[PDB]
Each structure stands twice: as structure tokens, then as C-alpha cells.
Amino acid sequence: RVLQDVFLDWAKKYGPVVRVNVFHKTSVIVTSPESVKKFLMSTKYNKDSKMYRALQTVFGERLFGQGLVSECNYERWHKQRRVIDLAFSRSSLVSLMETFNEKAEQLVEILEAKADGQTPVSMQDMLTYTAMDILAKAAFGMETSMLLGAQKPLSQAVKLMLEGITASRNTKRKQLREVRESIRFLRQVGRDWVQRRREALKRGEEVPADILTQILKAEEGAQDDEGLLDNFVTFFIAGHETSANHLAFTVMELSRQPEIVARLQAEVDEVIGSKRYLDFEDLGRLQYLSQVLKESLRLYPPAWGTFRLLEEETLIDGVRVPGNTPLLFSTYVMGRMDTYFEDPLTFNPDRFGPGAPKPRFTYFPFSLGHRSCIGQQFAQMEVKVVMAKLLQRLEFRLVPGQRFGLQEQATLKPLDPVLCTLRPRGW
């Protein structure tokens, strides 16, 4: 049971507008679809600086700073977004299919090597290394090779940093210094990878355009590299953590969903076959898998929502909310309200079937409007590639004792590490 589950009880009991404490700050959780549409779908409402200070700096160390997630002032964010947007064109994402295929295939062979049916493997960790290996190469041109046992300190540094964000937001000498040491380590990797890119361009090398290209470009007239490093850390973390968490939750759920797995296997067989490389066009045709990933997001959204600063006293669903109040919007909460979803605890991918009305402002795992996930299509593409490959080659069985609950760190993720034993598909 996480804090979001408490918010859900209160949304259900006390209605569509409810004053709550979150990250030790006062806020009003707003759960009507009409309010979601009103506040997220208009550029008039912007993020609440107060609620994002916990990402901007941690334990007296700059982290996300004023990067793309944590920048709340419209015009300023709009300056970065417009530039960084180019790195996410249809043609830019198509060019990444190689990275996604490579890392996915590497993942599967490591797993196939352990596929005896008695070797416990943490799918949470495995999926974390994959997501990080994908992001690092795709966004920055660098190989972290975590799948191959490499970069243990970097890995540890991300682990501690996320724990840092958590404790910061929820009220021991050593962990305090480790978190500071991890954050500094992280921004240091940043300058080195930035250093590497600039030096390569100073030797007149042809570097294919990526995310780093656009983050450098967004920081032209900068007295220092701090903005760029804000955006470096932003992408490094945002660009793998929630993707790994989404994947972990999907694998965990599917382990107790044998009929759904058969449909998925049946579908993977038709569209890709035993083919090794997935083409861009292959993704679109994996429609039942798309429905299952959507349904995984409804029940288990890694990023549970967002805040919008309400500048003036306003009437929200017959409720007078005082000005300068942070509005909380929770896709986690709405997804679990029987008011919006019939039998809400039932994992049913048929909810997203062809022909079913799309949810109207009751489902937003990538948020909505101008502050929506810039990485949506990136994430959706990479996770489809990863799952497709797993569904081709492997079957998982959750190790007895493995629980299905959640935890909240910087994001939602499984409470248990999704320990599985594996067999080749068919065994």
C-alpha cells in the first residue's frame, strides 16, 4: 500500500476535490475528467515550482536543476522543448530501431543462458540494465554495457540518487553523504560524456544527430555547462527509469495471466514470426501487445501524475479552492475508480480493444497537454521491442514468495524485484 492508494480512498470517499498533504506540502487532488481536461489541456496552467524543488536539488546538491522536467516557467521551458523536440521526430525515432533491437536481443540471450528453470533472475534489475543501456546509446552515443556486468558504480549511483529523491520528499549521516556523492558522480559522467562529444566534433567527426545534439544546442549562450548538465541528468534518469518500471510491472502482471500470454504469443508469431530484427513497421501491427501495455499503465503507472499551480481562487466542481494552491492530478487514482473503470482491479486488455471508446481524461500515464512526456513514442517503441523479443523466446515463472504490491521511490515500481525462473519458449 502506497500513498497513492490512500489518495484513492479519499477521492472515493470525499469526492472530486480533496485537500491532501503530499511530499510534506499542501495540495488539492482533483479527480473529475472535466478538471483534468481544463487544467492539463491549456498552456494557461503550468507546473508548480514548489512541488518540483524536490527534483531540482537534493540534500543540497543540484540534480535535475532547471532541466526539461523540473522547469516550471512556461516561456523558459518552451525554449528548451521546441529545440529538444527535433530529437523526437518520426525520422529520429526510426533511426533508433537498431539500438532497441540490439539491447533487446542482448537482454534475451543473457536470459536464455539462465533459462534452466531453477536459476532466480531479478527481472526488475535485468529490465533496468536494458533500459539504461538503450537510453545511454540512443540519447548520448555511449555504451554503458550494464547488461554485460559493466558500470557497477554508475548503477549504484542511480540507486542511491532515487532513494535520495524519496527521503527528501518524505521527511542517517552516511546515506546522506552517499546520496550527495552519487549525484555529483552522475553530473560528472555528464561533463565527461559532454567533453567526449565536443572533442569528437573538434576533430571534425560526423556524429549522427541525437538527444545530446539538441540539449547542447539548447544551451548556446551559456556562461557555464550547468543547464546542459541539468538536461543531461534529466534525460539519463527520465529516459530509463519509468521505462524499466513499466516493463517490470508488465512482466510481473503477465506471470499470473496465462490466457493473455497465449494471445500475446499467438500475435508475436503472426506479425514477426521467429524473425530476429523488428522493423519500424512491425511495431504498429502488434496491436494486442499495445493493448496489454496500455492496460499495464492504467493499473501501474510509474509516474502517477503531475501538479499544476492554481494562481487564483477558483471554483472546481462546486468547490472553492484558494489561490496559490498546487493541484494534484493522479492517473493512478483515476485508473482505480469504479466510477471510470468497470471492475477496476481486473487486468483486462480488452478495455483498449479496437472499437472501445478511448478513456476521456481518465487515463494519462504520459500526462497530457504541453507538459506531456516528450519521450512517449520513444518509450512505447522501446518497450514493444523488448516485450516482443521476450514473448518470442522465453517463458517466466514468478519465484514463490514474490509479491505483487508496489512501492514509491521517485516513481512507482514493484515492491519485490520480480524474481523469476526462466525456460525457452516451448522448453
Work out what residue 411 binds among ligand GJZ, ligand HEM, none; the CB cut-off runs from 5 to 8 Å by kind.
ligand GJZ
Interface with ligand HEM (CB under 6 A), residue from 96, 379, 391, 420: 379
Q: How many CA atoms lie within 13 A of 277 on its CB side?
A: 7
Interface with ligand HEM (CB under 6 A), residue from 164, 190, 302, 335: 302
Q: Considering only the stretches 94-102, 235-243, 398-406, 415-423, report the one whose residues sit in contact with ligand GJZ under the rule CB under 6 A.
A: 235-243
The three cell numbers locating residue 136 = 545511454
Show Cβ contacts of residue 225 under 8 Å, excluding neighbours closer than 6 positions: 191, 194, 219
- Run of H or E residues at 232: helix 226-238
Nearest residue (CB) to ligand HEM, 115 versus 165: 165
Q: Considering only the stretches 97-105, 233-241, 263-271, 330-338, report the one whose residues sit in contact with ligand GJZ under the rule CB under 6 A.
A: 233-241
What is the nearest approach in angstroms of ligand GJZ to the Cβ of residue 411?
A: 5
Instruction: Say whether residue 242 binds ligand HEM (CB under 6 A).
Output: yes
Q: Which residues are annotated as a binding site for heme?
A: 373
Show Cβ contacts of residue 367 under 8 Å, excluding neighbours closer than 6 positions: 40, 303, 305, 306, 331, 373
How many Cβ atoms are within 10 Å of 424's Cβ, its own excluded?
13
Instruction: Say whether residue 69 binds ligand GJZ (CB under 6 A).
Output: yes
Instruction: Say whether residue 250 binds ligand HEM (CB under 6 A).
Output: no
Number of residues engaging ligand GJZ in binding (CB under 6 A) = 11
Burial of 43 (0-12, 13-18, 19+ CB in 10 A): exposed
Interface with ligand GJZ (CB under 6 A), residue from 22, 54, 55, 139: 55
Query: What does the alpha-carbon distance between residue 115 and residue 302 come to, in Å, rounded to a whole number?
Result: 28
| Residue list 116-175, contact with ligand HEM (CB under 6 A) | none
Between the alpha carbon of residue 213 and those of residues 88, 141, 209, 232, the distances in Å are 12, 10, 6, 11
Work out what residue 81 binds among ligand HEM, ligand GJZ, none; the CB cut-off runs from 5 to 8 Å by kind.
ligand HEM
Query: What does the alpha-carbon distance between residue 239 and residue 123 come to, in Å, rounded to a whole number?
Result: 19
Instruction: Say whether residue 30 binds ligand HEM (CB under 6 A).
Output: no
> What DSSP character marks residue 357?
P
- Residue in the shown chain whose Cβ atom is closest to ligand HEM: 375
Which residue's entry shows cell 500515464?
A: 365
Query: What does the alpha-carbon distance between residue 398 and residue 251 come to, in Å, rounded to a whole number?
Result: 9
Q: Which residues are annotated as a binding site?
A: 373
Interface with ligand GJZ (CB under 6 A), residue from 92, 331, 402, 411: 411
Work out what residue 410 binds among ligand GJZ, ligand HEM, none; the CB cut-off runs from 5 to 8 Å by kind.
ligand GJZ
Instruction: Say whether residue 303 binds ligand GJZ (CB under 6 A).
Output: yes
Interface with ligand HEM (CB under 6 A), residue from 164, 190, 227, 239: 239
